[PDB]
Design an enzyme around this catalytic site. Structure first.
Site, short mmCIF file in Angstrom:
data_model
loop_
_atom_site.label_atom_id
_atom_site.label_comp_id
_atom_site.label_asym_id
_atom_site.label_seq_id
_atom_site.Cartn_x
_atom_site.Cartn_y
_atom_site.Cartn_z
N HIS A 84 0.86 -1.19 0.00
CA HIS A 84 0.00 0.00 0.00
C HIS A 84 0.89 1.23 0.00
O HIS A 84 1.41 1.64 1.04
CB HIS A 84 -0.94 -0.01 1.20
CG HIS A 84 -2.07 0.97 1.10
ND1 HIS A 84 -2.06 2.03 0.22
CD2 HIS A 84 -3.24 1.04 1.77
CE1 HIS A 84 -3.18 2.72 0.36
NE2 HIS A 84 -3.92 2.14 1.29
N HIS B 180 -2.79 6.90 -1.40
CA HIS B 180 -3.77 7.57 -0.54
C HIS B 180 -3.13 8.35 0.61
O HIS B 180 -3.77 8.58 1.64
CB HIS B 180 -4.80 6.56 0.00
CG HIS B 180 -5.57 5.86 -1.07
ND1 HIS B 180 -5.75 4.50 -1.09
CD2 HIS B 180 -6.21 6.35 -2.16
CE1 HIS B 180 -6.47 4.17 -2.15
NE2 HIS B 180 -6.76 5.27 -2.82
N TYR C 255 -0.65 7.69 2.73
CA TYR C 255 -0.19 7.01 3.94
C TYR C 255 1.34 6.99 3.94
O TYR C 255 1.97 7.81 3.26
CB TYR C 255 -0.86 5.64 4.03
CG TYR C 255 -2.36 5.75 4.23
CD1 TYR C 255 -2.88 6.30 5.39
CD2 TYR C 255 -3.25 5.36 3.24
CE1 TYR C 255 -4.25 6.42 5.58
CE2 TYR C 255 -4.62 5.49 3.41
CZ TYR C 255 -5.11 6.02 4.59
OH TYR C 255 -6.47 6.14 4.77
C1 FMN Z 1 -14.69 2.00 2.66
C2 FMN Z 1 -13.46 2.01 1.81
C3 FMN Z 1 -12.28 1.45 2.29
C4 FMN Z 1 -11.14 1.45 1.50
N1 FMN Z 1 -9.97 0.90 1.98
C5 FMN Z 1 -8.83 0.89 1.21
C6 FMN Z 1 -7.66 0.32 1.70
O1 FMN Z 1 -7.64 -0.17 2.83
N2 FMN Z 1 -6.52 0.32 0.93
C7 FMN Z 1 -6.55 0.88 -0.34
O2 FMN Z 1 -5.53 0.88 -1.03
N3 FMN Z 1 -7.71 1.44 -0.83
C8 FMN Z 1 -8.85 1.45 -0.06
N4 FMN Z 1 -10.02 2.01 -0.55
C9 FMN Z 1 -10.03 2.60 -1.93
C10 FMN Z 1 -10.54 1.54 -2.91
O3 FMN Z 1 -9.67 0.44 -2.90
C11 FMN Z 1 -10.69 2.09 -4.32
O4 FMN Z 1 -9.44 2.50 -4.82
C12 FMN Z 1 -11.66 3.26 -4.35
O5 FMN Z 1 -12.79 2.96 -3.56
C13 FMN Z 1 -12.13 3.53 -5.78
O6 FMN Z 1 -12.75 2.35 -6.22
P1 FMN Z 1 -14.29 2.36 -6.68
O7 FMN Z 1 -14.62 3.63 -7.43
O8 FMN Z 1 -14.51 1.17 -7.58
O9 FMN Z 1 -15.16 2.26 -5.45
C14 FMN Z 1 -11.16 2.01 0.22
C15 FMN Z 1 -12.34 2.57 -0.25
C16 FMN Z 1 -13.49 2.57 0.53
C17 FMN Z 1 -14.76 3.17 0.00
#
Ligand code: FMN
Length: 355
Positions: free
Chosen positions: A176, A179, A181
């Site tokens: 990871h 975002h 981090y």
């Molecule tokens: C509730 C939630 C938790 C997420 N947790 C992570 C995470 O732990 N690690 C990560 O790399 N991205 C995390 N994401 C981002 C998603 O992996 C993804 O990149 C983002 O939601 C866009 O995807 P989507 O438009 O298909 O929902 C999270 C997103 C949401 C909504």
């Protein structure tokens, strides 16, 4: 439908290109994986389908969310093994995402209420708030800028966690580095204000992610290592003056690591010519695109060669059979943001209906 043409992701043969994106759900009570997680991932697992778990702690200081699973204790490995077996019993491939929040933490999440660690002393600005264990929202504190000896210690935490994941039966891990981090706190020049060999130039700012990838690659093999980055996402003040140049610099080091190791990484995972097409063309290997993709957008991305795999996040929360729904072009269920990070093992977690 090209989303259901098979694909060879290193040693793993996938039957379709729909991937479960990593999603923190906060149901791993006290950082211990629970039986609810096994039910959750089993609902979404498919024969020949690729799953990426929620961000998982690599050390007692890596958490910035309540009740996120860890993989740094033997009790955590023991509980993860039961979840991996249930997922494997449905024919799916599963990677564990290793996650260090860096400065995106708080006193209540740290041992002895210590300060979070980061590349810098600057805290996340007042525009962002952290979710607290009681459902309220708190203030991000000042992090502690770590020295180079502590950097290699965090790299060792990634390495030991990668071995623990294989011990638990995981087919691989995902780094990871997205975002905003810990890894992104070294990548982005809007955060990395260091003057030592880990800050300044693109090479110095890419050094931390390079050492993390090389360490886990040397421990479990390149083909079991995925890397996720987000150069153009400004989450938690993770801005770069040139996101395209930074993304291409990261790819260049990933391409070099594969040449020095004699093997390709499992994939490169980018979440957001387009920025995404530029990084894909530059990367020598499998590419997973992420962020706001639909059924048609995912079909198009694979058909035009923009990506080899497409990961879905929010739609996978509310559609446990999202792979089947994408196949049949069946209507999808709405998701409830209110239960994204709650602790109930069923409500808003496993009670989303199947077709
Ligand atoms: C509730 C939630 C938790 C997420 N947790 C992570 C995470 O732990 N690690 C990560 O790399 N991205 C995390 N994401 C981002 C998603 O992996 C993804 O990149 C983002 O939601 C866009 O995807 P989507 O438009 O298909 O929902 C999270 C997103 C949401 C909504």
């Amino acid at each position: 439908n090209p989303l259901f043409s098979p694909y060879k992701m290193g040693k793993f043969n996938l039957s379709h290109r729909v991937v479960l994106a990593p999603m923190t759900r906060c149901r791993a009570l006290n950082n211990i994986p629970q039986a609810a997680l096994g039910e959750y991932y089993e609902q979404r697992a498919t024969a020949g389908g690729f799953l990426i778990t929620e961000g998982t702690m690599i050390s007692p200081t890596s958490a910035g969310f309540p009740h996120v699973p860890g993989i740094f204790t033997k009790e955590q490995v023991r509980e993860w093994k039961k979840i991996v077996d249930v997922v494997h019993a449905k024919g799916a491939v599963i990677f564990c995402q290793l996650w260090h929040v860096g400065r995106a933490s708080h006193e209540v999440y740290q041992p002895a209420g210590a300060a979070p660690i980061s590349s810098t002393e600057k805290p996340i600005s007042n525009r962002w708030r952290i979710l607290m264990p009681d459902g309220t929202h708190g203030i991000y504190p000042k992090p502690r800028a770590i020295g180079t000896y502590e950097i290699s210690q965090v790299v060792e935490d990634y390495r030991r966690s990668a071995l623990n994941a294989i011990e638990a039966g995981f087919d691989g891990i995902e780094i990871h580095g997205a975002h905003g981090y810990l890894i992104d706190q070294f990548l982005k020049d809007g955060i990395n204000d260091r003057t030592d060999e880990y800050g300044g130039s693109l090479a110095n700012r890419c050094k931390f992610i390079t050492q993390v990838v090389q360490a886990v690659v040397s421990a479990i093999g390149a083909d079991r290592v995925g890397v996720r980055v987000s150069p153009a996402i400004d989450h938690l003040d993770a801005m770069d003056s040139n996101p395209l140049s930074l993304g291409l610099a990261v790819v260049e080091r990933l391409n070099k690591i594969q040449l020095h190791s004699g093997s390709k990484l499992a994939y490169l995972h980018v979440t957001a010519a387009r920025l995404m097409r530029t990084l894909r063309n530059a990367y020598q290997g499998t590419f997973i695109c992420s962020g706001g993709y639909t059924r048609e957008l995912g079909i198009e991305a694979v058909a035009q060669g923009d990506a080899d795999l497409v990961s879905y996040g929010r739609l996978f929360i509310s559609n446990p059979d999202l792979v089947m729904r994408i196949k049949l072009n069946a209507p999808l269920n709405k998701y409830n943001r209110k239960t994204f990070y709650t602790q109930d093992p069923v409500v808003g977690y496993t009670d989303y209906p199947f077709l």
